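Researcher: I've got a protein sequence and the SMILES for GWH. Could you write out the 3D structure of the bound complex as structure tokens? I'd like something to compare against our soaking experiments later this week.
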Amino acid sequence: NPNYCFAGKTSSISDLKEVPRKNITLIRGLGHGEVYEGQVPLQVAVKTLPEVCSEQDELDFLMEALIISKFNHQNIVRCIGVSLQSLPRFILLELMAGGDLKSFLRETRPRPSSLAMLDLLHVARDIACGCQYLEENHFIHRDIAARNCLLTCPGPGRVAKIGDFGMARDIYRMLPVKWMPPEAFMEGIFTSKTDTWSFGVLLWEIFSLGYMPYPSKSNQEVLEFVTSGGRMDPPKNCPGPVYRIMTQCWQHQPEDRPNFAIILERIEYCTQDPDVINTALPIE
Ligand SMILES: C[C@@H](Oc1cc(-c2cccc(S(C)(=O)=O)c2)cnc1N)c1cc(F)ccc1N1NC=CN1
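Model: Sure. Here is the predicted complex with GWH in place.
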């Protein structure tokens, strides 16, 4: 059984909370291996490992379990436990009834039939807080993007959390190029400033209300665009103060990009600014 180290502490499969299979009930699919809504009553999202898999897939699954179980922060999805001693094997996560952030943005965007700038700034703050936690614990996420974030509920009290760690698990042992800084896809150098760049792209995703980054551009086109200094324009109706956070996250030199403490400070300032939060989002 392979070990996992986070924050200088070492854990193993034995440290995972094994939940008796008989105590676990599947309710319905949530999409995808496959993920189900379940009960243990505690509501859970149940990630499954296909029984037809390689020994490598099984190690990947175990490592994902260790990674999430060892985090402790309000903006990172909780792991209730695992069921690894029955097949198919389960990882049990906090059920985020709001679903993934990218689909939420698409589905909840203002129309003649609702969201405000403050809703978006709150999502941004939430994820930035999670990223700050990762940064201060020297963990590089490597794939900070709307598709990897979840919401506790559809309504105003929603809290956003980072909910997937598959890329980080792979690296611990298909590239998200549109979310990566120049030194990452060029030299394969990763640091906390890698996540800062990605957060800038997530910020664009959020204030565009769920558009794919670099509209009309392919991966290689983005690679060449970003490498030569190209940056995305502001999303429709995006306040200048918010766009300026994005452009700071996308500084070419990693040292010129803000850490997440500074990012959080800037998001907070935007939230206070009436001219920012009084700005209406577009209605499609
Ligand atoms: C592993 C999975 O975890 C979850 C999904 C949903 C969740 C996702 C979508 C919709 C709903 S719903 C129908 O209950 O509103 C709940 C709610 N809680 C989770 N803990 C997940 C984590 C992410 F960070 C991003 C996407 C997903 N998936 N995987 C398969 C589907 N989403």
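Model: DSSP finds ten helices and ten strands in the chain. Residues 117-136 form the longest helix (20 residues).
Researcher: Great, I'll pass this along to the crystallography team.
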